[PDB]
């Protein structure tokens, strides 16, 4: 409990903590990627009822992540938010596993809890583990930087294996073996990982910290309304700083429609998987398992771009990376409607065949999302790091999490928006995907994403003119 010591505060901070972030990552795909598959046939819900029920949970997980970090900085440490919210998810996810053995009226009540209770733990844990595990940073770094910067890339490209496995074997363990084991190992994993984290409380050193903007932004919002009747250095610096965060808004709000096209891939693009040519020789591929094409698309787009950057930067002269501030976001938003347009065409080519009376077909759409996604996220991330004052740098990861969350809610609004305006004679998102006319749902989304990208393209122009004067 006193102060720093080279022979105490160590690599356990690295090793024994991030295991929770790694388990939380195994969990969010392994569950979040599937779930609709479980709600469709195991719990028995309509195709337009499970996807809406899934987006809400995934979105909520990010909506929480915003508060998770804010709790961890502004109140009762970062070591507690890991301790409490790892435990909360173990309680949550262990109930989810008991929701696959005990026995809808008072079982959906039981499932909905464990689902949105896993998202509470998941949310608060993810927002603090990574930030706490990195507590391996000295003054000028006496040879720490070497092991630290390396360990994290020896962990980051390590959980990239465990992300592919989550979509591959964990799905297969749910779809073929049983949801008892599938969610069971996600639950045992977390108790085992939380127990070891708590045991290392010794080899870790906890540091004292405050969390803005939010606190500083709220104080300015108070000054606005309390001085409504009237219509020193803080006004000459701290208020002009807050106005700069309002400049991201159009770029921020336009990015929300990319996270809707990523949400269909998790839900609606799995109802198309299950209903088309499954078998490959003797054994088979699970429906959810098509996300390997999306996961691969990310991992390939990062690897290929990491080499194909200096080549782009040398041909067309730029400062650090291959023009990844604002052009990166746009490329991902162009690919965003492209996947939705490709999916619409892919639906017409085989549902029109079903009226006359499979695995290959969905691979492209899943990859077009994976390619555009690896750009937009690193475009979004490397935006307010380079385009926000250093007082609020890294304190605008919420500007990433608030893009996501709202993208899931924008999908769930859209799904319900076509549930009433097309129902019930011949709806798009039909209970029997073949009976209805689903492709028209992509004609609404692809179209929204295309026209959204057009306004984004006009926002960037009005930004390199209105924010290049500050």
Binding-site residues from annotation for substrate: 262, 266
* Range in contact with a second copy (rule: CB under 8 A) among 75-83, 126-134, 155-163, 421-429: 75-83
Which residue of 67, 110, 198, 331 would you call a contact of a second copy, by CB under 8 A? 198
Shorter beta-carbon distance to a second copy: residue 53 or 100: 100
Distance, CA of 418 to CA of 441 (rounded, Å): 8
**327 near a second copy, judged by CB under 8 A:** no
Q: Say what angle helices 12-32 and 179-199 make with each other, to 10 degrees.
A: 160
Q: How far apart are CA 329 and CA 326, in angstroms?
A: 5
Cα dihedral: 247, 386, 406, 27 (round 10): -170
Among 112, 116, 188, 463, binds a second copy (CB under 8 A): 188
> Which window, 3-11, 28-36, 154-162, 192-200, contacts a second copy (CB under 8 A)?
192-200
User: Which of 107, 137, 154, 192 touches a second copy (CB under 8 A)?
Assistant: 192
Q: How far is the CB of 19 from a second copy (least distance, A)?
A: 13
User: Under DSSP, is residue 279 helix (H, G, I), strand (E, B) or coil?
Assistant: strand
Is residue 165 within the footprint of a second copy (CB under 8 A)?
no
Tell me if 218 contacts a second copy by CB under 8 A.
no
C-alpha 280/C-alpha 363 separation (Å) is: 15
Q: Quick check: 80 binds a second copy (CB under 8 A)? A: yes
Q: Which whole-number Å values give the CA distances from 25 to 28, 32, 65, 74, in the listed order?
A: 5, 10, 14, 25
Work out how close the CB of 195 gets to a second copy at its nearest, in angstroms, rounded to a whole number. 4
Which is closer to a second copy, CB of 92 or CB of 370? 92
76 binds a second copy (CB under 8 A): yes
Q: Which residue has the tokens 């909506």?
A: 63
Q: Is there a contact between 205 and 135 (Cβ–Cβ < 8 Å)?
A: yes
Closest CB to a second copy among residues 51, 83: 83
> What is the token pair recorded at 332?
């991902």
Q: Please name every residue paired with 279 in a beta bridge, in sequence order, or none if there are none.
A: 284
Say whether residue 199 binds a second copy (CB under 8 A).
yes
Residue 279 interacts with a second copy (CB under 8 A): yes or no: no
Residues 97-116 that bind a second copy (CB under 8 A): 98
> How far is the CA of 409 from the CAs of 51, 55, 127, 246, in angstroms?
11, 7, 20, 22
Give dist(CA 318, CA 315) in Å, integer: 9
Q: Compose the 251-270 pattern: x for residues touching a second copy by CB under 8 A, - for all others.
A: --------------------
Of 88-96, 167-175, 335-343, 453-461, which part binds a second copy (CB under 8 A)?
88-96
Residue of 43, 67, 87, 239 interacting with a second copy (CB under 8 A): 87
Nearer to a second copy, 84 or 363 (CB): 84
Which of residues 87 and 361 has its CB atom nearest to a second copy in the complex?
87
Give 286's contacts (C-beta < 8 A, 6+ positions apart): 37, 171, 172, 174, 175, 176
Q: Based on the shown chain and the rule CB under 8 A, indicate whether residue 202 belongs to the binding site for a second copy.
A: yes
Please pick, from the candidates 153, 201, 327, 353, the single residue that binds a second copy as defined by CB under 8 A: 201
**Comparison of 125 and 351: residue with beta carbon closer to a second copy:** 125
DSSP code for 278: -
Question: ∠ CA(308), CA(294), CA(264), 5° rounding?
Answer: 130
Among positions 22, 54, 65, 90, the unique one binding a second copy when judged by CB under 8 A: 90
The answer to whether 94 contacts a second copy (rule: CB under 8 A) is: yes
CB of 55 to a second copy, least distance (A): 26
Extract the tokens encoding 350. Answer: 């085989």
- Of the candidate residues 51, 194, 248, 448, the single one contacting a second copy (CB under 8 A): 194
Which residues does 188 contact at the CB level (< 8 Å), separation at least 6? Answer: none
Q: How far is the CB of 4 from a second copy (least distance, A)?
A: 16
What's the min distance (Å) between Cβ of 84 and a second copy?
5
Q: Where are the alpha helices (DSSP H) in 134-233?
A: 144-159, 161-165, 171-172, 179-199, 214-226
Q: Check the CA dihedral 319-321-325-329 and report its sign.
A: positive
Query: Considering the rule CB under 8 A, would residue 129 count as an interface residue with a second copy?
Result: no
* 434 within 8 A of 315, measured Cβ to Cβ: no
Q: Does 169 bind a second copy (CB under 8 A)?
A: no
Residue 376 in tokens: 């937009």
Q: How far is the CB of 179 from a second copy (least distance, A)?
A: 15
How many residues in the shown chain lie near a second copy by CB under 8 A? Answer: 20
Residue from 165, 191, 299, 444 that binds a second copy (CB under 8 A)? Answer: 191
Stretch that binds a second copy, among 86-94, 137-145, 299-307, 399-407 (CB under 8 A): 86-94
Residues 6+ positions from 324 with CB-CB distance below 8 Å: 375, 378, 379, 382
Q: Under a CB-based contact definition with an 8 Å cutoff, are residues 346 and 365 in contact? A: yes
Residues 6+ positions from 205 with CB-CB distance below 8 Å = 4, 8, 9, 13, 135
Per CB under 8 A, residues contacting a second copy are 1, 76, 80, 83-84, 87-88, 90-91, 94, 98, 188, 191-192, 194-195, 198-199, 201-202
């Amino acid at each position: 409990r006193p102060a720093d010591r080279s022979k105490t505060g160590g690599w356990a901070s690295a090793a024994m903590i991030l295991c929770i972030e790694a388990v939380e990552r195994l969990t969010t795909l392994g569950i979040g990627v599937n779930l609709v598959t479980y709600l469709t046939g195991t719990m028995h819900l309509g195709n337009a009822t499970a996807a809406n029920t899934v987006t809400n949970f995934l979105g909520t997980s990010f909506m929480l992540c915003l508060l998770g970090g804010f709790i961890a900085d502004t109140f009762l440490g970062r070591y507690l938010t890991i301790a409490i919210f790892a435990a909360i998810q173990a309680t949550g996810v262990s109930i989810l596993t008991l929701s696959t053995i005990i026995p809808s009226g008072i079982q959906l009540t039981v499932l909905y809890l464990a689902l949105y209770l896993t998202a509470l733990g998941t949310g608060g844990v993810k927002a603090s583990v990574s930030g706490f595990g990195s507590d391996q940073f000295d003054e000028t770094e006496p040879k720490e930087r070497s092991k630290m910067t390396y360990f994290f890339n020896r962990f980051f490209f390590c959980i990239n294996v465990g992300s592919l496995l989550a979509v591959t074997v964990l799905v297969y363990v749910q779809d073929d073996v049983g949801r008892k084991w599938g969610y069971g190992i996600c639950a045992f994993a977390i108790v085992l990982a939380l127990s070891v984290f708590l045991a290392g409380t010794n080899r870790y050193r906890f540091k004292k910290l405050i969390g803005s903007p939010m606190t500083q932004v709220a104080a300015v919002i108070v000054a606005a309304w309390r001085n409504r009747k009237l219509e020193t250095l803080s006004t000459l610096t701290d208020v002009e700083e807050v106005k700069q965060i309002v400049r991201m808004l159009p770029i921020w709000a336009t990015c929300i429609l990319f996270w809707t096209v990523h949400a269909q891939l998790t839900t609606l693009s799995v109802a198309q998987s299950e209903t088309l040519d499954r078998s490959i020789g003797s054994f088979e591929i699970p429906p959810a398992s098509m996300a390997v094409f999306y996961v691969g698309g990310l991992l390939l787009t990062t690897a290929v771009y990491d080499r194909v950057a200096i080549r782009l930067c040398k041909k067309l002269f730029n400062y650090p990376h291959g023009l990844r501030p604002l052009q990166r976001i746009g490329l991902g938003l162009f690919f965003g409607s492209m996947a939705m347009a490709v999916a619409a065409l892919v639906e017409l080519k085989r549902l029109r065949t079903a009226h006359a009376h499979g695995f290959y077909l969905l691979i492209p759409q899943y990859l077009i999302v994976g390619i555009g996604e690896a750009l937009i996220y690193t475009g979004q991330l490397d935006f307010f790091l380079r385009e926000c004052p250093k007082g609020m740098k890294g304190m605008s990861t919420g500007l990433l999490l608030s893009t996501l969350a709202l993208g899931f809610f924008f999908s769930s609004v859209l799904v319900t928006i076509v549930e009433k305006f097309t129902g019930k004679a011949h709806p798009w998102i039909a209970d029997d995907l073949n009976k209805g006319r689903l492709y028209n749902f992509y004609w609404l989304v692809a179209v929204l994403v295309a026209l959204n990208f057009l306004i984004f393209l006009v926002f960037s122009k009005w930004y390199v003119y209105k924010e290049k004067r500050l």
